[PDB]
Amino acid sequence: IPWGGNLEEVLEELEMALLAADVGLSATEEILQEVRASGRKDLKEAVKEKLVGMLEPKPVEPKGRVVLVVGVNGVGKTTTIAKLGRYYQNLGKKVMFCAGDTFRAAGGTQLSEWGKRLSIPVIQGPEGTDPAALAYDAVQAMKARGYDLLFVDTAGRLHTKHNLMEELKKVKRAIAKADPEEPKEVWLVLDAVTGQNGLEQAKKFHEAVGLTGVIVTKLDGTAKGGVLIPIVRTLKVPIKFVGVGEGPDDLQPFDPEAFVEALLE
């Protein structure tokens, strides 16, 4: 991008960069239009103001004691929960995990291993146990121990699978049954490599269980995570953290200005 030169050529370049970042046609067009109609010639900081502003629709404080973690298969839910245990134990919080993926091969054992590495206790059942009943029991356990935070892992599910989205809904009600205030956080995990489907994922999970935040993983890769733009524009859901690796420390609270700088880089 030639930040200085011919407006019409600076905007052609910006369009390309946004499209290559997975911003998508609709959001890219709207950004470009809004900037054109603004009359502004300082295109660099008009575009930057716009993007940083929309991505805000500093330590992250959960609004309650139970965080429910959701998303499609393979996006990084289990690993992110491990990183959230590390993040919050560093802040002197008493953290418990619920291995609520009782469906996939080694889905519970996987989070258990992380629990052992991190000295965080993990509520598990045998494969096939009802994840909603397990979440209920996990919440009761967290209350009884006086713990600060419980992270509820869930099986990966495609947002197109209607009944599996109903299962997620039951999990949420089961949490609320054990503790009426909960869950005060429902965080979608999105893989940064995802294209336009990320918007549909976000829409459908929001519809099902009502998101209070998004975590974008795998932002250490070459992908920019650009579909966050239409997600936040459309759903007004704040971005909480970014995942930048496979270790328990590889989590950063979301920084809109640095994200935007990276997106256009």
Partner: protein, 292 residues
């Protein structure tokens, strides 16, 4: 024939209108390029493809035709079917077979290894699974459990085990048990992680696989071109598996990956279950991308 909303409008607005201006043609091709990008086709690949369509349509006299909607649509469809492979094609197996499953973190490799084990078991081959991912927690157990489910043995690689040691244990189990299809499940890795890409290339050099399958998630966006190019240049890819096609992602990453590699998309993953494997049909994906 119903297309995506965007293409229905772009093609539909041309219908019954006789010959169209060069500006209406240019307008139509721009909309095709945008549709492809909406479908997660890499922007450069999209530009390249619509240049190929423009030239083909012009050789079919699109600007003299009284039915240019028909000429354009036919050109686009047939070009997309062709660029995706033309017809279904499966691997050709030899007397002995050793394959790698490679790709990004979370794409579907471990599950795909087990699906292939079941598919070929049913065709009277004798598979062996190799759990070669020693970095992801419970990766070995994950494949062991899937092997048990599909009734196929699983060799689990040890922490720190050298490629040469792996090779010896694998060839010996395959000898003792007369296993003719060996499926090596590798850890997910970034295409820019030079140490891990180097590791993978050194496992390939030692093990000598006949096939190296890039497992690509259907929801993958613009980076599919870069990822496929890198796995191909750094390791060598012989074919692709497109996973999670039971979702609603359009699957345009398959066009990016096939464009830059020229390699066949062999299989489609269509559920989370061992049975959720089908041959890939380029005509089917062509329709999915175009919103048939």
């Amino acid at each position: 024939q119903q297309l995506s909303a965007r293409l229905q409008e772009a093609i539909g607005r041309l219908r019954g209108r006789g010959r169209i201006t060069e500006e209406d043609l240019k307008a139509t091709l721009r909309e095709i390029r945008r549709a492809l990008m909406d479908a997660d086709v890499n922007l450069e690949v999209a530009r390249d493809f619509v240049e190929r369509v423009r030239e083909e349509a012009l050789g079919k006299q699109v600007l003299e035709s009284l039915t240019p909607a028909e000429v354009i649509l036919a050109t686009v469809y047939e070009a997309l079917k062709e660029a995706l492979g033309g017809e279904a094609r499966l691997p050709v197996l030899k007397d002995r077979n050793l394959w790698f499953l490679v790709g990004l973190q979370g794409s579907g490799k471990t599950t795909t290894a087990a699906k292939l084990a079941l598919y070929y078991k049913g065709k009277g081959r004798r598979p062996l699974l190799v759990a070669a991912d020693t970095q992801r927690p419970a990766a070995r157990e994950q494949l062991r459990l899937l092997g048990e489910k599909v009734g196929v043995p699983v060799l689990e690689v040890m922490d720190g085990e050298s490629p040469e040691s792996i090779r010896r244990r694998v060839e010996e189990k395959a000898r003792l048990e007369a296993r003719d299809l060996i499926l090596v499940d590798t850890a997910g890795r970034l295409q820019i992680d030079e140490p891990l890409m180097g590791e993978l290339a050194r496992l390939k050099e030692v093990l000598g696989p006949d096939e190296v399958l890039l497992v690509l998630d259907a929801m993958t966006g613009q980076e599919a071109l870069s990822v496929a190019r890198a796995f191909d240049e750094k390791v060598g890819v012989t074919g692709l598996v497109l996973t999670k096609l039971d979702g609603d992602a359009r699957g345009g990453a398959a066009l990016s990956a096939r464009h830059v590699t020229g390699k066949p998309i062999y299989f489609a993953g269509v559920s989370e279950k061992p049975e959720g494997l089908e041959p890939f049909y380029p005509e089917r994906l062509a329709g999915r991308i175009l919103g048939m």
